[PDB]
Tab-separated table of C-alpha atoms and ligand atoms in Angstrom:
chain	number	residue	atom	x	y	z
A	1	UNK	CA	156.521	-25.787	-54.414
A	2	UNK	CA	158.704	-27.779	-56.858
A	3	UNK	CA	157.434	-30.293	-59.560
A	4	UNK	CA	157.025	-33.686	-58.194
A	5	UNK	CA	158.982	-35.595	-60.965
A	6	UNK	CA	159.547	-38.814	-60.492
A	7	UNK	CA	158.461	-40.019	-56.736
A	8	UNK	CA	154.598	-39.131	-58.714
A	9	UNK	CA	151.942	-37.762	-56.455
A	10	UNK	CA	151.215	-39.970	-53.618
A	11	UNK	CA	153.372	-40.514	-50.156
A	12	UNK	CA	152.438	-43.298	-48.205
A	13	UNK	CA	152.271	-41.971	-44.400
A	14	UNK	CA	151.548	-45.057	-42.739
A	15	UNK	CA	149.236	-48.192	-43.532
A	16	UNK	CA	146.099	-46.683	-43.405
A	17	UNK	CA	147.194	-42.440	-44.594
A	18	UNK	CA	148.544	-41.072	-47.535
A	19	UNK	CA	149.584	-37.907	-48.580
A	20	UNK	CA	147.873	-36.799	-51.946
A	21	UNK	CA	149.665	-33.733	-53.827
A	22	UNK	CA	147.518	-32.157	-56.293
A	23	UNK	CA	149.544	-29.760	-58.316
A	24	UNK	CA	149.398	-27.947	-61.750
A	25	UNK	CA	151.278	-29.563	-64.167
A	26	UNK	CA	154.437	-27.127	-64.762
A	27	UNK	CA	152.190	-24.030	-66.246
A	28	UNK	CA	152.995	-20.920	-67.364
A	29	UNK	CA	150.802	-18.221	-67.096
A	30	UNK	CA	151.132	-15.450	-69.807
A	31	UNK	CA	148.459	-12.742	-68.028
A	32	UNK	CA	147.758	-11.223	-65.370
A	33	UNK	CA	144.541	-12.833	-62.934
A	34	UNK	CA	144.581	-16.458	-64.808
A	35	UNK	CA	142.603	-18.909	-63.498
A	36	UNK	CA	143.939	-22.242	-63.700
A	37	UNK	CA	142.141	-25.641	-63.171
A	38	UNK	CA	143.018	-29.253	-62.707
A	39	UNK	CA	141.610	-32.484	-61.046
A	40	UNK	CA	142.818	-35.703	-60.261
A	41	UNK	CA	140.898	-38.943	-59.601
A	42	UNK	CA	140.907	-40.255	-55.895
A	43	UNK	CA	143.535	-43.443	-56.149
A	44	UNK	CA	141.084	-45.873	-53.720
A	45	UNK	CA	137.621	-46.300	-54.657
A	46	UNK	CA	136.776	-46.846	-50.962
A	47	UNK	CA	135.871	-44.163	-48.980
A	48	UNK	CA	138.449	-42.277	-46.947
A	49	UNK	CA	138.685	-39.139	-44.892
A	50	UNK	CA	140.135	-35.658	-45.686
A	51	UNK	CA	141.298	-34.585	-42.341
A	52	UNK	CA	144.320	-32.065	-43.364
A	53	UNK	CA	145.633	-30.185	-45.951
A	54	UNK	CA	149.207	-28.271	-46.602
A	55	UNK	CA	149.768	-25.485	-49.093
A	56	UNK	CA	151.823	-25.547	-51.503
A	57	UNK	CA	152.282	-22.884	-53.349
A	58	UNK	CA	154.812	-20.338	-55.147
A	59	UNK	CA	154.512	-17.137	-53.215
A	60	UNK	CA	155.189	-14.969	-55.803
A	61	UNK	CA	152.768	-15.382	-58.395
A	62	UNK	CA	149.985	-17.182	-56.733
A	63	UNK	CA	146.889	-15.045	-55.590
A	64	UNK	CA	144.547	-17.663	-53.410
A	65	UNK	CA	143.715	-21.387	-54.658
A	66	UNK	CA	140.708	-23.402	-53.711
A	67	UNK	CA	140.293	-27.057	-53.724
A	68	UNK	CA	136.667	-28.915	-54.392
A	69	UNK	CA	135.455	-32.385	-54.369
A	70	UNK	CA	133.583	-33.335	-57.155
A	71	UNK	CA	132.530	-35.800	-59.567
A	72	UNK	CA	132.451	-34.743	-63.176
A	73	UNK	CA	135.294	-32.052	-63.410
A	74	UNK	CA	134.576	-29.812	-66.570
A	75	UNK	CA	137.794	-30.892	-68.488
A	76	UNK	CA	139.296	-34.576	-68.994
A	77	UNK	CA	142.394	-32.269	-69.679
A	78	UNK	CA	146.022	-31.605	-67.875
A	79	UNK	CA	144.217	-27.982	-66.989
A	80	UNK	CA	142.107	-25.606	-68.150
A	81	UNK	CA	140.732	-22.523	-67.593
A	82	UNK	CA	138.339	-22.350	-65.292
A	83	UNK	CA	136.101	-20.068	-67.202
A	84	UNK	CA	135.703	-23.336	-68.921
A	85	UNK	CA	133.727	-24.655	-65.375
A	86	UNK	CA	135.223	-26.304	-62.470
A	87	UNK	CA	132.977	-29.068	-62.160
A	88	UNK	CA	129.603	-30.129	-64.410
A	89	UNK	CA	128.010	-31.393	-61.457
A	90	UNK	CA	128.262	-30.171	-57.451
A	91	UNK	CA	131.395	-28.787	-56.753
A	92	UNK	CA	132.165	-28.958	-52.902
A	93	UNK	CA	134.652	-26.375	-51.800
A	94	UNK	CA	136.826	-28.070	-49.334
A	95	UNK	CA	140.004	-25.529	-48.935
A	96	UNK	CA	140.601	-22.021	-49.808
A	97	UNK	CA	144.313	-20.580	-49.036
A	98	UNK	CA	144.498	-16.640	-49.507
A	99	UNK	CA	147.537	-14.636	-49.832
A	100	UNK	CA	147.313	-12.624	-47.035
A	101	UNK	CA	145.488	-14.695	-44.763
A	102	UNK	CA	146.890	-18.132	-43.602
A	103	UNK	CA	143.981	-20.356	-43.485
A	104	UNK	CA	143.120	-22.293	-40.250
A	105	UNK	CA	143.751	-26.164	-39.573
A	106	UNK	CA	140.623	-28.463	-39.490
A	107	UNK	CA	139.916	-29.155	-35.775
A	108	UNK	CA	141.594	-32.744	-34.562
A	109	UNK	CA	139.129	-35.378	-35.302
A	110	UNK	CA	136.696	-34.022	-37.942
A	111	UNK	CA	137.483	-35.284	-41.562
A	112	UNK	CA	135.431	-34.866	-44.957
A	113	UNK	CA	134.291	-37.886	-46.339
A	114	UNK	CA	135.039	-38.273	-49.848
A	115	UNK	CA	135.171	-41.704	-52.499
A	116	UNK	CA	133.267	-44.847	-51.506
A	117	UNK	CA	130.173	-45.322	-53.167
A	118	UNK	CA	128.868	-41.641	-52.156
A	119	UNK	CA	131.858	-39.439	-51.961
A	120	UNK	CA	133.843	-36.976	-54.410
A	121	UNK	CA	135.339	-39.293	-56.796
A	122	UNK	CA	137.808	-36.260	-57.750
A	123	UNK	CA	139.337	-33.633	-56.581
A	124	UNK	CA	139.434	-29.884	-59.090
A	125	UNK	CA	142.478	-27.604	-57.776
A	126	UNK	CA	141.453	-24.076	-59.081
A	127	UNK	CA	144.960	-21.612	-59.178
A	128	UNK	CA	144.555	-17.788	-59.390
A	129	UNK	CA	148.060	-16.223	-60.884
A	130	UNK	CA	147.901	-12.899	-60.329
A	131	UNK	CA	150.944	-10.672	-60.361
A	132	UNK	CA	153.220	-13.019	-63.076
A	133	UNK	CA	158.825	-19.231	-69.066
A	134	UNK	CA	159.244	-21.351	-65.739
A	135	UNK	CA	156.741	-23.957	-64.865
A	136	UNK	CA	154.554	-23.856	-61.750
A	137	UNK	CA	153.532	-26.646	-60.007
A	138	UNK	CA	151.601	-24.626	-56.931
A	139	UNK	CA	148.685	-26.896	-55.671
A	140	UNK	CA	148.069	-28.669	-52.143
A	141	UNK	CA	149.157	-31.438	-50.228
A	142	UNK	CA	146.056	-33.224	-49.232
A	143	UNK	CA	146.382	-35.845	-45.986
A	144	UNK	CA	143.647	-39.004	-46.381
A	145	UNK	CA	143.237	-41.889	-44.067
A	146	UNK	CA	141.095	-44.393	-44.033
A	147	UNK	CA	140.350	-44.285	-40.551
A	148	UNK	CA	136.333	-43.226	-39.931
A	149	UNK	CA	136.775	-40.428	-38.082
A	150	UNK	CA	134.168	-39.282	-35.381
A	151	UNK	CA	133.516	-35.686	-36.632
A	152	UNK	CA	132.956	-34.861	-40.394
A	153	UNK	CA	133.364	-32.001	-41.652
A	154	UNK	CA	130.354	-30.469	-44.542
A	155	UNK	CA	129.223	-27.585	-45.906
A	156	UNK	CA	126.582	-25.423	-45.898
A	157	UNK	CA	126.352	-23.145	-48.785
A	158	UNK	CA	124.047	-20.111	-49.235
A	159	UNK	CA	123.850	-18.392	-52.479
A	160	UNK	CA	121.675	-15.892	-54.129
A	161	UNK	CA	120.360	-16.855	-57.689
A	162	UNK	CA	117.686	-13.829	-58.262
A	163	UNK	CA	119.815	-10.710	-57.151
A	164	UNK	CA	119.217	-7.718	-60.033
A	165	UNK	CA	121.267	-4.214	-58.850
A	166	UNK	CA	120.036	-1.955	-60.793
A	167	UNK	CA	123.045	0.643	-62.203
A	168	UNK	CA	123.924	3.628	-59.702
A	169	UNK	CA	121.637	2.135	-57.055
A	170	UNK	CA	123.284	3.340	-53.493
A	171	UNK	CA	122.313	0.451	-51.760
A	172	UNK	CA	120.890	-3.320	-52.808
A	173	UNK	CA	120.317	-6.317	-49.793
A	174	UNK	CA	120.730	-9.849	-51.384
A	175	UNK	CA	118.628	-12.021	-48.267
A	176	UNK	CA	119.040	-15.741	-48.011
A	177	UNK	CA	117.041	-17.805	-45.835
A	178	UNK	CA	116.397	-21.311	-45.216
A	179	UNK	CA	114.905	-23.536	-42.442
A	180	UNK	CA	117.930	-26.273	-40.705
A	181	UNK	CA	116.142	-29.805	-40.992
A	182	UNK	CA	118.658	-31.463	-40.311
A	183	UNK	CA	120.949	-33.176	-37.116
A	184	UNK	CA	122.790	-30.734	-35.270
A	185	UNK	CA	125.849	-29.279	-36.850
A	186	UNK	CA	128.612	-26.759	-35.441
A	187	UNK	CA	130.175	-24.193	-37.209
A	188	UNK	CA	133.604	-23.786	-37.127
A	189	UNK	CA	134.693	-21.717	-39.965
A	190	UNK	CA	133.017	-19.358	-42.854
A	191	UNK	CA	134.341	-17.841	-46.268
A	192	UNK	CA	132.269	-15.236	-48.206
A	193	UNK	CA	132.378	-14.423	-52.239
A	194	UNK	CA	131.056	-11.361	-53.691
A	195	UNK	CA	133.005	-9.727	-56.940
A	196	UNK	CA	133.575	-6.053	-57.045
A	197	UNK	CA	129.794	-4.608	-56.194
A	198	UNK	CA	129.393	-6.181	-52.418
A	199	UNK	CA	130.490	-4.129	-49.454
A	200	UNK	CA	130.213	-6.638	-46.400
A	201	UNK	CA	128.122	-10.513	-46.100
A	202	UNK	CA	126.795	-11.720	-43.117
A	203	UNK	CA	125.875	-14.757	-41.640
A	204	UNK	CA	123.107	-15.915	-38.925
A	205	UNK	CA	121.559	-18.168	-36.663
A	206	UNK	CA	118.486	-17.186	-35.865
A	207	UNK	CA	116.592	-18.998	-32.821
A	208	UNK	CA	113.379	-18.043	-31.294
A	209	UNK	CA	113.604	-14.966	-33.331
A	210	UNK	CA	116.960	-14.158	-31.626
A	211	UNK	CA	120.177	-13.383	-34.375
A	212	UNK	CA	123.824	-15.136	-33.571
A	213	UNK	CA	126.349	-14.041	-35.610
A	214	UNK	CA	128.521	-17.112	-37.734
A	215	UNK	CA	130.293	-14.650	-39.879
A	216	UNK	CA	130.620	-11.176	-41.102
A	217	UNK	CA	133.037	-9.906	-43.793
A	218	UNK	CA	134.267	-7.308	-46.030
A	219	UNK	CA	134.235	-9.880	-49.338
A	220	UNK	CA	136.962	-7.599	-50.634
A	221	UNK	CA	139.362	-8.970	-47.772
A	222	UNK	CA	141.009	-11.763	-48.876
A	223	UNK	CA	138.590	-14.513	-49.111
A	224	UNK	CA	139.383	-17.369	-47.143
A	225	UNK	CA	138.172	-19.686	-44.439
A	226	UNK	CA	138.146	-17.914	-41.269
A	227	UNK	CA	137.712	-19.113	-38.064
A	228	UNK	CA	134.282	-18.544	-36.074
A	229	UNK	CA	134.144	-16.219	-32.975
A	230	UNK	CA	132.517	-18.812	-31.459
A	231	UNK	CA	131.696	-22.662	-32.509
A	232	UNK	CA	127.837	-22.093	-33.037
A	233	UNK	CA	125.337	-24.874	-33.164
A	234	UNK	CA	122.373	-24.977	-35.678
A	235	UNK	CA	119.523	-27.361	-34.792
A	236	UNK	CA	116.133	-28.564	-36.755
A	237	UNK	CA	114.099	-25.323	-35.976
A	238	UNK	CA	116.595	-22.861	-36.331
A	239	UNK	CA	116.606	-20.535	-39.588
A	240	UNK	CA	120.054	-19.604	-41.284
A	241	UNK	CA	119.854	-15.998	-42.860
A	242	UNK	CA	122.402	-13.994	-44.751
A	243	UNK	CA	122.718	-11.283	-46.149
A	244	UNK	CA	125.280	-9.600	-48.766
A	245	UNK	CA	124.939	-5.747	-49.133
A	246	UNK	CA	125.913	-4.801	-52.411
A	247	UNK	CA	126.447	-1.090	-54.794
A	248	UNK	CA	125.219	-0.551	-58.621
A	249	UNK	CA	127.719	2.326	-58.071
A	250	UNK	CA	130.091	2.836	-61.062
A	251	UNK	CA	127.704	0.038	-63.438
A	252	UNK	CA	126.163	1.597	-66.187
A	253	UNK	CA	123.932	-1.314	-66.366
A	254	UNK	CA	122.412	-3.789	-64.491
A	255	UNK	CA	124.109	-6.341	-62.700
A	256	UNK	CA	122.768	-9.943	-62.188
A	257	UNK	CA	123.851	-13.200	-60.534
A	258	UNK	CA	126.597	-14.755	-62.918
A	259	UNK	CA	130.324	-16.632	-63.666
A	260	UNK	CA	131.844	-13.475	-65.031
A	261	UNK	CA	133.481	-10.257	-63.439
A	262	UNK	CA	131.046	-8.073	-64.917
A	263	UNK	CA	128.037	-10.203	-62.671
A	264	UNK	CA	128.058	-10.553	-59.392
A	265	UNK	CA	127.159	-13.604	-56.885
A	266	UNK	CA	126.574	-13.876	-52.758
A	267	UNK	CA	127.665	-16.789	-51.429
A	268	UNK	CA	128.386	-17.883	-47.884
A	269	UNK	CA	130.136	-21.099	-47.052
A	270	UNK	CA	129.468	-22.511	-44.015
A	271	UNK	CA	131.850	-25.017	-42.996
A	272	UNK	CA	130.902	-27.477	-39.909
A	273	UNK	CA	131.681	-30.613	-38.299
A	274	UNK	CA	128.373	-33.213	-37.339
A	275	UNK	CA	128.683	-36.214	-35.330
A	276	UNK	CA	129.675	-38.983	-37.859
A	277	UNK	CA	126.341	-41.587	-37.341
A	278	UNK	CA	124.531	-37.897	-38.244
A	279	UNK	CA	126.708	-36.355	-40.154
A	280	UNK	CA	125.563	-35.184	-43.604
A	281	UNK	CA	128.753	-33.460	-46.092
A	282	UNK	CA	126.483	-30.745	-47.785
A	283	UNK	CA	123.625	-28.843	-47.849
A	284	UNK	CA	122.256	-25.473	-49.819
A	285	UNK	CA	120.376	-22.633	-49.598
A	286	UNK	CA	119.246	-20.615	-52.000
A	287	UNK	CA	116.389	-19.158	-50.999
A	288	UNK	CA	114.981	-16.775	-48.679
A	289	UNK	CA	111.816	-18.388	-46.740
A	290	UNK	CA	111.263	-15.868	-43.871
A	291	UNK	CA	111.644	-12.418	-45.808
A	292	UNK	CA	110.177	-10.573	-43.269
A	293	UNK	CA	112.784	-11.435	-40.278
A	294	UNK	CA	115.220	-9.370	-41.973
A	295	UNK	CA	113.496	-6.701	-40.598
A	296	UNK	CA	115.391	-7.730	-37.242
A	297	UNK	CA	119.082	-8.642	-38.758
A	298	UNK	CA	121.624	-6.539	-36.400
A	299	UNK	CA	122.521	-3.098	-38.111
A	300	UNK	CA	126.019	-4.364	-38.767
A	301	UNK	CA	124.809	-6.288	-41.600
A	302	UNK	CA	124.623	-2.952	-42.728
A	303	UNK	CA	127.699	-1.084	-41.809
A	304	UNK	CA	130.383	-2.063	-43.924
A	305	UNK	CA	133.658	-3.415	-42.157
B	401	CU	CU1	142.941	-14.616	-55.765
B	402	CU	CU1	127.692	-27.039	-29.109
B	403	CU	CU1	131.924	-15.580	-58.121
């Protein structure tokens, strides 16, 4: 989308909305795969509500962008590159457009909850040029109200951090696994990550030893937010297992969990909507407390799709 120029970044949209365009300053890639990064301060200190979100970017050069919430961004710059870091502390992945697939609206009611005392205090716009002496200013429009809304939206990350595939190997499982303590929360959407090495990620509820699906994915596909088959609730008991099946074929050494291209990393991002006097914005997993249950995960955690 074109540079903002002089109206600046924020449109009121009423008395109590704004609309919040985060963009990157007129930049001009010079290789191919760049990664760009920016932030921008929330303009209230109160809390407010994320509760939609509009792309805005140049078709032509842009691979995928993702927006986080966070509170120490890893440059005071204009942008940087995110090799540099997106964030020093938490970052909390709140959008993810894809090329090819045209992410899904946040269901009608359910908001993230960001500023205030506990809340993001930025937001970090990350911007992957792929295919490339004009100046982009791709980004997102971000819609925030201050209007408590009734469902907020959080996430649920699971991530590997001891993963080793050793070089060659045919076939290496990365399991997560973690107990839900927490109120009830529904799914309603999933991205996985992966770099070159994984061949499909899975996701699971598991209840009374019984496996529901959240997500499943080729992490090669364009990695956005899809939608879930089917809105599935996770309550205290419950275990959440994934499960990222990954090759050591074409390595010549071994690969471990890391930043760069060369490393590899299995993340699932569960996104979910709790009842707001419950609701909590994020939670993590990365570890695998009930090893042995993977001996029951449904063969297409396997079988690559
Ligand atoms: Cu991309
Ligand atoms: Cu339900
Ligand atoms: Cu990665």
């Amino acid at each position: 989308n074109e540079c903002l120029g002089t109206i600046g970044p924020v449109t009121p949209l009423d008395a109590s909305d704004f609309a919040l365009d985060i963009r990157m300053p007129g930049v001009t890639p010079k290789e191919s795969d760049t990664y760009f990064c920016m932030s921008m301060r929330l303009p209230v200190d109160e809390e407010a509500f994320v509760i939609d979100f509009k792309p805005r970017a140049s078709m032509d050069t842009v691979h995928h962008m993702l927006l986080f919430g966070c509170n120490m961004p890893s440059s005071t710059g204009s942008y940087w590159f995110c090799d540099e870091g997106t964030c020093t502390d938490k970052a909390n992945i709140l959008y993810a457009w894809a090329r090819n697939a045209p992410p899904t609206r946040l269901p009608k009611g359910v908001g993230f909850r960001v500023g205030g005392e506990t809340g993001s205090k930025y937001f970090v716009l990350q911007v992957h040029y792929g295919d490339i002496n004009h100046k982009d200013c791709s980004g997102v429009s971000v819609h925030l109200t201050r209007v408590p809304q009734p469902l907020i939206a959080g996430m649920y990350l699971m991530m590997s951090v001891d993963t080793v595939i050793p070089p060659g190997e045919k076939v290496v499982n990365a399991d997560i696994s973690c107990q839900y303590k927490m109120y009830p929360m529904h799914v309603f959407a999933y991205r996985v990550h992966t770099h070159h090495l994984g061949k499909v990620v899975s996701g699971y509820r598991v209840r009374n030893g019984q496996w529901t699906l959240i997500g499943r994915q080729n992490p090669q596909l364009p990695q956005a937010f899809y939608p879930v088959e089917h809105p599935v609730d996770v309550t205290f008991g419950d275990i959440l297992a994934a499960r990222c099946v990954f090759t050591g074929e074409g390595r010549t050494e071994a690969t471990h969990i890391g930043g760069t291209s060369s490393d590899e990393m299995c993340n699932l991002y569960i996104m979910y909507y709790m009842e707001a006097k419950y609701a909590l914005s994020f939670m993590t997993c990365t570890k695998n407390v009930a090893p042995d249950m993977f001996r029951t995960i449904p063969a297409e955690a396997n079988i690559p799709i």
